[PDB]
Design an enzyme around this catalytic site. Sequence first.
Site, mmCIF file in Angstrom:
data_model
loop_
_atom_site.group_PDB
_atom_site.id
_atom_site.type_symbol
_atom_site.label_atom_id
_atom_site.label_comp_id
_atom_site.label_asym_id
_atom_site.label_seq_id
_atom_site.Cartn_x
_atom_site.Cartn_y
_atom_site.Cartn_z
ATOM 1 N N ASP C 36 0.877 -1.148 0.000
ATOM 2 C CA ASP C 36 0.000 0.000 0.000
ATOM 3 C C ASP C 36 0.925 1.211 0.000
ATOM 4 O O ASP C 36 2.114 1.075 0.280
ATOM 5 C CB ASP C 36 -0.927 -0.065 1.202
ATOM 6 N N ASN C 89 -5.389 -4.750 -6.623
ATOM 7 C CA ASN C 89 -6.530 -4.128 -5.968
ATOM 8 C C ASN C 89 -6.383 -2.632 -5.794
ATOM 9 O O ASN C 89 -7.392 -1.967 -5.648
ATOM 10 C CB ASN C 89 -6.815 -4.809 -4.662
ATOM 11 N N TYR C 155 -12.683 6.294 -14.334
ATOM 12 C CA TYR C 155 -12.810 5.088 -13.531
ATOM 13 C C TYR C 155 -13.439 3.979 -14.407
ATOM 14 O O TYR C 155 -12.929 2.847 -14.469
ATOM 15 C CB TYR C 155 -13.639 5.360 -12.285
ATOM 16 N N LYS C 159 -11.589 0.616 -15.625
ATOM 17 C CA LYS C 159 -12.058 -0.697 -15.190
ATOM 18 C C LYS C 159 -12.441 -1.577 -16.387
ATOM 19 O O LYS C 159 -12.198 -2.773 -16.352
ATOM 20 C CB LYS C 159 -13.188 -0.552 -14.171
ATOM 21 N N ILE C 188 -19.826 -1.124 -2.189
ATOM 22 C CA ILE C 188 -19.453 -1.808 -0.969
ATOM 23 C C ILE C 188 -19.354 -0.763 0.138
ATOM 24 O O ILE C 188 -18.882 0.331 -0.114
ATOM 25 C CB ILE C 188 -18.079 -2.502 -1.200
ATOM 26 N N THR C 190 -17.957 1.462 2.612
ATOM 27 C CA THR C 190 -16.679 2.002 3.080
ATOM 28 C C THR C 190 -16.954 3.145 4.047
ATOM 29 O O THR C 190 -18.108 3.547 4.216
ATOM 30 C CB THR C 190 -15.818 2.539 1.936
#
Lengths: 248, 244, 248, 244
Positions: C36, C89, C155, C159, C188, C190
């Site tokens: 990261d 990821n 984005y 993707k 999702i 977050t």
Amino acid sequence: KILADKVALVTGSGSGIGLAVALAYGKEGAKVVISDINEQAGNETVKQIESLGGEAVFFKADSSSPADNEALVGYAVKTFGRLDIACNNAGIGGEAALTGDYSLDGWKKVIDINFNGVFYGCKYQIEAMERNGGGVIVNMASIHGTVAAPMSSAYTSAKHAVVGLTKNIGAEYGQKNIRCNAVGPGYIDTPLLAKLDKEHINALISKHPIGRLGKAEEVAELVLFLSSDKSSFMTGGYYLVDGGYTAV
Amino acid sequence: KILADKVALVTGSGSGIGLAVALAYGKEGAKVVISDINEQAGNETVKQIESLGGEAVFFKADSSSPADNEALVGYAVKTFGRLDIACNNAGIGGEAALTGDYSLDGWKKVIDINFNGVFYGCKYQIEAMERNGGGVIVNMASIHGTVAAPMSSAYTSAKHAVVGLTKNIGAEYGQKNIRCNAVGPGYIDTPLDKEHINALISKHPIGRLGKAEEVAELVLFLSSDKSSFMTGGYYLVDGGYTAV
Amino acid sequence: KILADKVALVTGSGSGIGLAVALAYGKEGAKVVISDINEQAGNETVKQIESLGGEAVFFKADSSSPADNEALVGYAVKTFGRLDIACNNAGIGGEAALTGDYSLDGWKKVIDINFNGVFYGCKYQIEAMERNGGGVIVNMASIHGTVAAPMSSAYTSAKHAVVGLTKNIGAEYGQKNIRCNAVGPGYIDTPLLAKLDKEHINALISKHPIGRLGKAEEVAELVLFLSSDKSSFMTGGYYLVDGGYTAV
Amino acid sequence: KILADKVALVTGSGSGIGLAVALAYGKEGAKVVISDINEQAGNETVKQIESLGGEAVFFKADSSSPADNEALVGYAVKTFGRLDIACNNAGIGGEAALTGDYSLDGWKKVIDINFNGVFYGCKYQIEAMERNGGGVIVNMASIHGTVAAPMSSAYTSAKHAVVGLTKNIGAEYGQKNIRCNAVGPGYIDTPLDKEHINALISKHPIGRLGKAEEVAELVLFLSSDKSSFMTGGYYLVDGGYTAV
């Protein structure tokens, strides 16, 4: 006239999209064979095509019947000598129910008209087209050949099936000069839809990024393109006319 | 065991993928209802599951029949109290013929088994699951739910329909705790020109046919709680076939 | 333990989905390499994996850098002797603007992290995997690898590109024992999304037929499956975990 | 003439599909801005359009450059007053290499031209169209916007991106009268092992490569009012390539 000297067949052509396709074919110089379950609606389409300087005849047929499909193609070939183009458009929406609640008879009805009848049309159309050097089929699918229509499982399943049949025909007949493509309309203004309440209509519109329902004429433009020699390298394909519905 | 105490049905579980699925369900603790048109094969699957220490019963059914599908689910709920999982696998390949040459009877047979019969299964499965707070369905489709199989128009059309039905069920029952997903296998080793076999393999970038057990692993995942956010989806298990 | 004796790499693993994937890999007996941009978040993931009886190390990397990707893979192989599994990821959401208004710098940032960085990871991962007999890659895409995200063109484009890269790797390495698949999550839960207002959140939920946002753990289950030998016949594929978002 | 009085831009219109598109636009009455990195080819397209009695100007541009894309649109609006139609066609095939072997520079070159450059075009095109009440964009993708091209990962990735960008523009500008659609050609005859050529053709069920003019007919339709209800879509012109 982009369809001069061609013979074209349109099922379910008494109204809606089928009507607009028949008018477009007529305007572009095809000899048109109109077919529908309703003879008054069919004769009217013929009159309209003739009034605009075109040529057309009507043949009553139940698109779910193999024999009627064979007889329809036979009539086209008897009347105009060949079959070049077919638009398989006859279709019903079906009952609205969740899948687990969907009637057995209502399921069968939708599958037999919207899917089996398309195969029976294609089968007999192919036979004629192979005899007269090839041809072009446009199968009418729907956005619901790729995305769900909750409460309309039979319709969705049938329209998916039409897409698969299309790919199969295009792949099989690629070197036999028969092209086959499917059209997937979004929601199109009908009288039916005027019958739907105004909140249901606005909800439908909100699902189209273009921010309106489509018109039958706009669907017929894409059908006309895919029926013509302009689309000569296009086969086995599915082509959306949905105002962006499936893009999100 | 990830399916412990769950009740699971598999149609066409006398052989091939359906057998592999039933063995996977059995090994992970489910009570399994085996169904097949062939009693000998079906009874044999039950024995193999039992031999591994699982629990299984057989119910003979013609998956094209609404009444048989309703009776199969009814038998599962009568025998074990509930229906948690169903895998709709029963299907036939059909005659090999160009679309224009496809027989009327042969067309109907394939559509009735591979299309209508999956719906009849789903219908009655859904009905039973809603009584017990929900459940999970896996419909068996095929690569031919998205790409053509020349000489097999009925099969391709039916497998596309199964994908559509799956999307509909998943979208309709999202807030009713019934998930439904479709699996799309590539060609799988089952008991035929060498040249035909090599042509098939050449169409799979992985360079071999798949095994039934490899299909069943995906079915198992999609039938378990591990797949809890997955519904309405179509999941390929195809050695790359549809990627090219 | 389904990943016993495997070495796995997870980029962007300091939080969210990347964290859940790292924990799942750790629990299933993989030696995990955490990476990261944020070292405190990365060291924390390592601590958590260790506290549950797993093995893990952290390596700081900018996933948009080719050199950092090469060094990350080099570190995995130095530390644990091989590389079996990689989950690509690391990703940003980007600015929100219509396409015509999208900044040039903001475009480049999103393309470089979400797409070019995935290629740089894959390139160096493949090199190691070919040396150690093969391996498995999971690329993190999104629903927006197949459907639009209005105001997020970079984005969506990135993707989509990850899906194409995935198909390419799966097709190319099919007989070289490297599998590559893409995962497409819906929305999702977050902390970010808690920052979003409550009307935006409800609007997002309404677009998921399952009627809730997903959890990072639920995405990690599918990543774990596709990372394992259970998925041995799956390659070049895109697998949705979206609560039905794309089904309608 | 279906594009009468419309102003249209085509990138990479010195040859191949881009030339065919420009000729189609010119023949249907548009004022056409030709752009290409190669001045000689571009000037030659202008002459062929002029020779047919159409109107066309050339503007040299590197489609990977934001500034050149902005200047190309600016030139169209300065020359003809407005921008109605744009076809983003400019692209390169790139190096042939397995993903793991793909060079860093070669990767960047392909992505910059085939991915980023289409965005830079769309960005400035959109800006100009909104000043004049809207317009239509056709992005040139490829079959490789949906299926793999082994040895060409950068090209495949970029063409997938173009599909995504297209969906986004179409969805975002639905109520602002800007439509955007993508075209996916199969392999087209352009000026190479016989065996490689035959392998390509064997992958097209129609049994031949396509012609640039056949691609341009679809672009023309998608650029006209006839396609008024079509936006955000991806439209194959591939001889059946992706159907199997």
